[PDB]
Each structure stands twice: as structure tokens, then as C-alpha cells.
Amino acid sequence: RTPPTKVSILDIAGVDDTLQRLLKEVWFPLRGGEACEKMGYRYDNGVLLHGPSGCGKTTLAHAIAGSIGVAFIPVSAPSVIGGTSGESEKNIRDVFDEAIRLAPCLIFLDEIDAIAGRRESANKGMESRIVAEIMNGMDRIRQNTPLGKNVVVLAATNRPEFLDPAIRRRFSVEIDMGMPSERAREQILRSLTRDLSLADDINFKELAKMTPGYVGSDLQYVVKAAVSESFQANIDSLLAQARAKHPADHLANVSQPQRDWLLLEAHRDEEVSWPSTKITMEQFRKAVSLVQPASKREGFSTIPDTTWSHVGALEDVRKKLEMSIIGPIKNPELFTRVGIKPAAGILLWGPPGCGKTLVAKAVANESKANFISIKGPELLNKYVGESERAVRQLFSRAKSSAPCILFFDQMDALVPRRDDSLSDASARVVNTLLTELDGVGDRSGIYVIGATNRPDMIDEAIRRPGRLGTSIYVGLPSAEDRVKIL
Amino acid sequence: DRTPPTKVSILDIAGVDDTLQRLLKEVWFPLRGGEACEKMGYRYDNGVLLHGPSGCGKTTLAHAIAGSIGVAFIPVSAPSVIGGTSGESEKNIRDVFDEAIRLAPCLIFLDEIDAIAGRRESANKGMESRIVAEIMNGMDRIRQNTPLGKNVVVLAATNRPEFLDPAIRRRFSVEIDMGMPSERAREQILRSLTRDLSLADDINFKELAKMTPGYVGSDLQYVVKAAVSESFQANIDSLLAQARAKHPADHLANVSQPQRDWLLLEAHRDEEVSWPSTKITMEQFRKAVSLVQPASKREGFSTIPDTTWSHVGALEDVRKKLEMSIIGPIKNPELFTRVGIKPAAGILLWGPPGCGKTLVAKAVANESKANFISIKGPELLNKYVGESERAVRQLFSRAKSSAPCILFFDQMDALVPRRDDSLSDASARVVNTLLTELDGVGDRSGIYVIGATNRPDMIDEAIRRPGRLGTSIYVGLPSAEDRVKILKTLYRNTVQGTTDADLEKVALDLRCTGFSGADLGNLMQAAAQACLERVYTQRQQKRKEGEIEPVITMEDWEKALNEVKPSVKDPEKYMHS
Amino acid sequence: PPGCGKTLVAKAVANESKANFISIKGPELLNKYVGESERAVRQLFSRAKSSAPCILFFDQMDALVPRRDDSLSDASARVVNTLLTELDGVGDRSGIYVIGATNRPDMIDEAIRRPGRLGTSIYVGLPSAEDRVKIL
Amino acid sequence: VSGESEKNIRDVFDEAIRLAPCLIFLDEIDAIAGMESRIVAEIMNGMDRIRQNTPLGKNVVVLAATNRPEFLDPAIRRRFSVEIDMGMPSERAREQILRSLTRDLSLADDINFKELAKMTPGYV
């Protein structure tokens, strides 16, 4: 038997355009059987969902299957591989025959990337005949369906690149469930905290405005952390009661948290009830800080703990940076209304010891946004392939976790002047950096801050506006500025 | 077994007129002219090989041909014969071949023959080799066991002829390439697909053919499926409205609109209603065409920039050249071909930074309304030795397939370095491959290459030789009067004292001599920043020490002009040598 | 001047000699293979010797042997030495003669220009007005 | 011809040297000299045994033909130092091989194979 699930649409939100298009594309073939029979047209389709991991594809498919209510066959990627050389080939055929026989139905091929990888990149025979068997059978439903009861093939992957373009041509309606936006994130938060005793003073808009780039799973983890924060007080009460019942002066002298664990063993079977309470907004503010976003791919250095109180004098540069980066980052609406794009950034220059690095670190700390630091020319790699892919991947993360502040320290070595043919590895990283800074492809939300001591060694194609071109002199403080800085 | 069914007819397939005509003298004749060969006394031991883009109808073509001919046929698929127990695969192959010989004459179709007859070197199993040799030996058994009156031809189809073992590929003497359908072929296949559909007479199939350059048969099948879905979308709305009105309380779920509609759909489920057989309008086809774009969605084409000519000021000469060289021929090829301007290989922009070569290229890509590919610097180089040039070859194959297309080699300095010195050696195989592939794309092919750079001295001088990108269009610093138009356009792209009569005064100031387009943009941004700074003073004095006004004042431009300097210093270094 | 009518000049000599005419389109023989890069050169001369008499055309001569002021690229050295050996082996009586074509004499390997090997440098002129009429 | 074909080649070679003089030819030797490595080892041992076991007055020559010299084993390449160049086929050769293609073909009397070869310079 292949019954539906119980994950009804109320658990999915923020994908209204995707949800409506999938409605128009999938609901009709599974409910227009009368319409198709009247038209006499063999209507079946293959819909494939691709995008960032955790956007909800595996749950969107389950919700759709539950809503439709027709027979639905969960078919995971590795549950189809058998022992003997040919058992899996017959297993795929059996799956498709079970689908076609019990029509109409919905087929979900979860993680199709693993079993339907590119044949040229996987020349071992077994997965080759697996891909060939899927290719052969997928047209069997198109040819041999009894008209009135068709079948739709649905699949979800976190990566479509390794998918065979041959099998990709079969799947017509490709839907890109991208990373949710602010309005989408607020709706997702509401949908997740639909059935929680949440406090009446909650502001979902305040949450959404401070969620730069989280994903549905990230918001799920936010809710989960908030739940535990709400019960921390009751855990403390239980700990106090356990301490009180068995004082023995002190059960241990090793430490307090370890003594807590040792005490919690002393009861185990002693069941206790946990009363609940409304989850406070401050608890949500704490939980979002405790949980780490999906952008934790070791590419965002910890924010420096240097506020403006750590820098003295430098009023002009501080005001200019407040106007240029701190301004738009804190009140984007005001700057957008005037018509100012996300600033390309600032290229600091001056003699060493003037504190430009400290000013940049202070700006990064004040922004209260995701920050990326690059310790000089660490991007360059021995292999030719990675030397540019590192920069492109860095900018991909920066765009995906917008807004973000980029701090390329010591432009001098990372991007030397390419006017004359000096070297080859650097001559390509400079070109890819120029292409990424203002070439084709939007980068709203990226601010590039560079510091160097040799302004006349960077390619003049970079000091141009649209890239970090607004250079700011930072030099020796005057006689009176020394009093303030000291 | 026995004979194929008539589930698919010749009418069901179209757009293969040349292929079908060539195949007529290759499969039909040595199945009905068996008496002709018997009197001729000539054995026909050859294999017809079908190859082309995926979904060109090879699987349907084989079934249609088999049904039309009517001779006994056994469908043989690559996974359909592989067995678990050892020797069962040879048993299957030999028994199928013996049945074919016994029931002569017959046709044999081997779908996805590449999936079996691949490469024996890449896999070490001793089970694929027995089959790759059994194909050969059974083929020879047909070569021997024929009475010269009942000859058997084997048909093989695949989407990757290269992946086949060349030893097997040698004896498939005739390889038939069902290439990408042309303009008339797409119109014919569209008619064949919409043979059984109710269509209003206002539909112009010429427009539909003209709007689908890079499409395959399966592509148009998906397009017509989308058209049918759009046709029934109206009844979908009617049913949704009726169901929503049926339910009480007006509003039931305040979660979201589409989710509420989904819930209401399951709320009744069995309340089916008659589905009107509405006619498909041409507007529905136009809508459906813009959605479904497969066979070219494999990350090969970037999103089209949303920059029209309204986003660029001045630059009338380069715009005229681009319109008359690239934009024009795509829109109306016949007029240009009559005057002797074939689809060019492309052009090569070059100039100091800040002029807007990238902006011009993006605008041309947007106005062309064709498939666009952007190569962001050296995205082709790979750590593996055999991938760096394979990327270039695959890119040009994709560009050739989806004609017309625009290839944008931004910052070619990283792709075609001046190799007068020993700057690089492992990238020589890249520039050589790029030159070979550029020479492989000829006139009337439909591929245009647009490249830009900041240093004309870094690009290899072999590029500028004709045939390759030899049409160099220079873009320099805009003149004093051009800055007026540039400022007007940029301010029109911002959103009140606009006061366009003072834009010339601002631009023509002696402090604004050597700025470029990006430099005027920076000056405008600085003026807006000065205005916003004044906003803080006004808000913190009139209100805090006693409103909101984003209107830019004239004095702000003068204030910002002092603190802004030209970006490029010596363009003479950039333009000559 | 660039490669406007060098193929015409080579083909006229081939036609008057009434021998075989084999041409290589510059940067085509050099592909991702390095072992077979010299093998292709060897095979071309082998077939030319088999089909003697023959004339061999190398347009865009820069694509094979630029100036080796810096003999760093090992594959380039492997190609140039093998090509020099094969062309030097058969230049007197075998009936095979190789034609070198390029745009500038000064971007070719120096070890070729000296006598014995391809040392005969000939300047091809631009078409005249009467030629220009036919070209139009 | 994985051990049984090697025994068959031993059967051929031992009788060839035993029944001397004799002519031995192995057609498409490349396709079985890439099991095949065992075939190459058998060929090496056989050529050595012909070198050492010949009566010195009645020997046998291992003759072979390959569609591509590069496919053969480099050791076989050095051992097979005797080469004969079958270059561009002659006009008479092309005409006669055309007639050797058309034995059982039902052809009219108008065929003149002489001119076809004369206008077939670049074919094999």
C-alpha cells in the first residue's frame, strides 16, 4: 500500500509563487483526468525542484502528496540498489510498473543526483545501466498510461550539476526554490510557530529584518533553540530540587556542571512533569544568536571586538565611513530612497602605523553584519583551477549572505599591477577580481574594504568607481590629535 | 514478440524529412526489396546508427519505422537484457540473435547502445567484456547465416556517439545525425503536435517557429503541454472561485492565498465539475513559450541583464555599430543577408575603464532577446589537464546548438595572454583551443562573440586577425557635451529640483574635464550623499532643537564636485601601445 | 601581410609541380595531447614520403615554433626538435618540400632560418588594382 | 585464435618450425596484441624459440600486418624492425580492387573501370 502523508500545507510557506505554479502544473494532471479524457490527450509531466539545501523540497513534495491524496510512492535514492548485477535494474522497472499499474499516482525520486549522475563521470557499469533503466522506464509511463489515469514524476536535489543533461531534458518544469527573502522568512517563522504558546508581544517583523540569509532549516533550529531557552528555567528548578533532596554537604568537588550531570543520574527513573510558559521575544533574540546560520562554511571570521571607543581622533574619516558604509547598512530604506546603491567600498591608503586597519575593524564591529577577513594573498593556490575559484566562491558566499563587509588586507600582493606581464597566476586572479567587482552580475549587499601602504601599485582599473575607488587618506595625526589618541 | 504494434504512426512524427528520405533507401529497401537483393545476390551486413541531441525522437522514430514496415521486430534495450547469474547475459544476447536470424527478415533496435557498448578500459569487470564481444560475434553470425533473400539490418540509437567503443562504431558504417530542427521543421512539428487540438484560426505558426530558435521536439512537446495547462487554467480559476464561495465564513485560513486555495481544493476533492473544451488562443502559446526552456538550461546560459538603451547615455556610434552588426541580423536575418552581411563571428571592444563597454555589452544582450552566455574572466581553467580545453569545446558546442547566441568574453586578458614572452605554458593549450574553436564557427552559423578589456596590449595579436575577433570598436572618454547626456540619463535612472538646465552647467565645469561615465556616476552619488548629510543637519536642528526631505539641492553638486577627482590618470598609456 | 592569399601562392606552386598538396591550418596539430603532438608531425612527414612527390604547407607558422629565446616549455622543445629532424631528413631527393607561411619572419624559431633548412624567406605582396577589381 | 589461445599459437608455431620451411602470417595482429598481453608473451617466446630452434637452413618467418603500427607493443615494434610501405594505391591497383569488389554484382556491360581509377586519386 502507498497511502499519503500527514504534513499538510500549513507547515510550508514563503513559496507562494512556487506553490501556485506547482499547483497549475501538478494538481491538474492528477485531477484533470476527466478533462484529459475529454480532450483525449496523454498528459503527463516531470517536475524537478533544484536550489539551496534546506529550502523544503523534501517537505514540499510530501505536503503536495498529502494534499492531493492519490497514491504516492516514496522512492529514496539508495533504497533501489540491490545485490546481484541486475537486481537493481529490475527494481527500477518494478517501481515504475507499480506506479503505472496503480494509476493515477505521484512518484517522488528523492535525491536523484546520487543515482542519476553523469555517465561520463561514472563509467562503472552498474550505475550506467541504472541511469539507462530510468531513462527507458520514464518514457514507459508516457507511452503506456491508460489516458484517464496519468502519472507525474517529481524529484528533488540540492545539486543539479551532476545530473545527466539527458535525464534533465526529461524533466520539463524546473523550479528554482531560492533562499527565502524577508517577507518569506517572516511567513516561514509564523508557520513554524503556528502551534506554540507564543507570547502576545512578539514582533515577527523585528525577527525578519534581522535575519540576513537564514534558510527554513535555520529557522526551524531557531524555534528549537527558543523552546529549550524557555525550559532552561524549569531545568534549573529541577536541578535545585535534586540538589536539595540529596545535600550531603556537597556530592562532589570536581565542578558544578559535572556535579549536575552526576546528580541527574541519581534520579533517572524518577519522573517529573514540566509546566510550560509563553516564549518571550527576548528569548527569540537570544536563540537567533545561539544558532549559527547556514553560511558557517568557515568563510566568515569572528567579528572583531573593537568599538569606536578604541580609536581616537580621526573624526573626518570616521564621519565619512559612517556616511558611506555604516549609513546604508543600518538604514537601507533611507539610502535607497535617495537612490544610492550598496556602496562598492573604500580603499584605505597611508603610511603604516596610522590605524587604518583598526578603523576598518571598528567599522566591521559597528555594522553588526556578517564579516569576512582575508589575511593578505591567502587566496592564491598552487593549482591553476582553484586560484580563481576561491575568489568566485568567496563572492558567491558574500552575495548569498548579503549584506556582508569584505576586508581584503594588503591589496599589494593579492592584486598586483597587471600593466606589464610580470607573472601568470596573479594576472588571472586580478582579472577575475575585476570581473567580479563590477562586471556582469549584480552584487547588491557587498561592501569591499581594502587597506594598503602602496596606493600606486594597484591596477588603475580598480581605483575606478563601481569598485573600491573612493580612496581615503589616513596619515600621521596632527600635534593636537596626539592628545586625543593618547 | 512477433510484429510491432501500430501505436505510433508516421503522421505522429515530423521534422525529419531529410532523415526519413535517407533512411528510406537504408531500412525499407532491405526489408521489402528482399527479392531485389536475392536476384542481385548481395548480402547486406551493415548497421544503421542514430545519433543526435537527446529527445530528437529516435525512440519514437524506431517504433514508427518498425510499425510502418511491419516485419518481425524484438525491442532490445540496454538494461533489458543484463542478468544476474553469470552467462545469462550471453544467453540472452545469443538467444535474441538466434531468434532474429530464425525469424528473418527482421529489424533489431538497440536503444541506448552506449550504455552497454561503452569503454572497456574504464571498468575492470569481466562481465561487460563478454557482452561487448558477444555483440560482435552475433553480428558476424548474421553476417554468415543469411540466405541472401532474407537479410537483417540492426538499428542502434544513442545521444552520445563518442562514448561508444570505436571498435564497434567502425562497423556501423552509416551514422545518421538528427540535428536540431530548423525553422520550417519546428513549424511542421508544432502542427503535428497540434493535430488533435482545438485551435483558433488567429494562430500564426510562423511566429511560433520564429520565437523558438534553440528547441528540440521534446521542447515543443513540453510547450504544447504548457499550452494545454494554460487553456484549462481558466476552468481552474472558475472551480477555485466556486469552491471558495461555497465554504462559509468568507475567510477560513489567514495563512496565505495559494495555501488557502490548496486547502480548499482538498476540502471537497470529489466535487468534480464538467471541464469546458475551450480553444487554445495564440496568446496562451506566447505565454507558454516563455516559461518552458529545457535542453538549454544546463547552467550554460546566464540570466539576461535588465539594462535597455535607457540605461546608457551618449555612445551613439558604438550603439549604431552594435545595432547594425549584432542586434539587427538576429531580428531580421533576410534583409541583412540580401545586402551581404552574414552573421558575424563577433567584435572586440577595448578602451580605458569607466567608459561603459560592459554596460554596452549588457544592453546589446538585453535588446537582442536571444540566449546569452557570460564568461566571467578565467572560469574555463581547471586543475585537471583534460578539463580546461574540454570546457571551451563544450561551451562552443552549446553556443553552436542554441543559435542565435551571444558569447561575452569579459576581460579576455586572462584567456588570451600575449605569449611573446614565456608568460604561460600550460595555458597555451587553452588559447590554441580557443583559436581553433573560433575558426570552427563560420559565417551564417549564428554565434556572436563580444569581448572587452582595459589593456589592448595584453590580448594576443592573433585575435585581431580577421575571421576571428578582428572588428575592434574603440570606446574612449566621453566629450564635454556627452557628459550632459550621461548625467541626464543617470539622473533619469535615479527616481523635486531636477533642473535639467543646470546639468550642463555641472558637467561643463572645468573641474569636470576628465571624468568618465562611472566617474559621473560617482559624482552623482557624492552629491546625493551631501544632500543626505544636509538632511541630518536639518532634521537635528529644525526638529530636534525646536522633517524628511530627500530632494537634492543645487549647491550639493558643487559641494561634491570639490571632493571628486577623475579616476583614470593617463588614457594615452591605454589607447596607444 | 596577413593570410589573405598565401594559400593561393602555395597552391599555384603545387599545381605547376603537379604534386600532392598537404596543408596544416596552424594551431590545429597542437591539442591537449603531448605524446601524440610530435606523433602527428611524424605521421604527416611519413605520409608525405609515402605520397612522394608532395608539397607541405604550414600557414601561421608562429603556432608551432615561436622564438626560443627562453627554452622553458619542454613540450615546445620536443615539438621543435622533432620537426627539425624530420624536415632535415628529407629535403634533397625524396621530393618532399615544406612551405612555411607566417606574418612576421621575426617570430619564428631561429634554428630554422639558417641555410639548409627553411632559410628561404620570401615576401608576398599585396594584390594590385586589377586583382582588387576581381576581389570586389 | 586466457591460456587456450596461447596453446593454439604454440601448436601453430611448434609445427611451423617442425614442418620447415613454412610461411606464417597473422592478420590484424594489432587487435590481439594490446588475454592479449598473454598473446604478446606467447609471441615473444615463439620468436625466441624460432631463433634458437631453427635448423639454420630451413627457417620460418613470422609475418604480420597491422592497420596501425602505433597499436602494437613497443617491444614488438623494436623486434619488428622490418617495414614495407604500402602507400597511396596505384591506379591499376585501385581499378583491380574495384573489380575485386564487384565479382557477384549483377552489372551492365557499360562499366569501364579504367576511368574510375583515373578519377579516384584520393581514396583507399
Ligand SMILES: Nc1ncnc2c1ncn2[C@@H]1O[C@H](COP(=O)(O)OP(=O)(O)OP(=O)(O)O)[C@@H](O)[C@H]1O
Ligand atoms: N520554506 C520552508 N518553510 C517551512 N519550513 C521549512 C522550509 N524549508 C525547510 N523547512 C523545515 O525544514 C525541515 C525539513 O527540511 P528538509 O530537509 O526537508 O528541506 P529540503 O530543502 O527538502 O532539503 P534537502 O534538499 O537537503 O533534501 C522541516 O522542519 C521543515 O518545516
Ligand SMILES: Nc1ncnc2c1ncn2[C@@H]1O[C@H](COP(=O)(O)OP(=O)(O)OP(=O)(O)O)[C@@H](O)[C@H]1O
Ligand atoms: N587612531 C588610532 N586610534 C587608536 N589606536 C590606534 C590608532 N592608530 C594606531 N593605533 C594603535 O596602533 C596599532 C595600529 O595597528 P594597525 O593594524 O591599525 O596599523 P595600520 O597603520 O593599519 O598598519 P598595517 O598596514 O601594518 O595594518 C594598534 O595597536 C592600535 O591600537
Ligand SMILES: Nc1ncnc2c1ncn2[C@@H]1O[C@H](COP(=O)(O)OP(=O)(O)OP(=O)(O)O)[C@@H](O)[C@H]1O
Ligand atoms: N519529430 C518529432 N515528431 C514527433 N514527436 C517528436 C519528435 N521529436 C520529438 N518528439 C516527441 O518528443 C519525445 C521524444 O522522446 P524519445 O524517447 O522518442 O526521444 P529520443 O530522441 O529517442 O531520445 P533518447 O535518446 O533520450 O531516448 C516524445 O514525446 C515525442 O513525441
Ligand SMILES: Nc1ncnc2c1ncn2[C@@H]1O[C@H](COP(=O)(O)OP(=O)(O)OP(=O)(O)O)[C@@H](O)[C@H]1O
Ligand atoms: N556611458 C555610460 N552611461 C551610463 N552609465 C555608465 C557609463 N559609463 C559608465 N557607467 C556606469 O559605470 C559602470 C562602469 O562599469 P563598466 O564595467 O560598465 O565599465 P567599463 O568602462 O566598460 O569597464 P570594465 O568593463 O573594464 O570594468 C557601469 O556599469 C554604469 O553603471
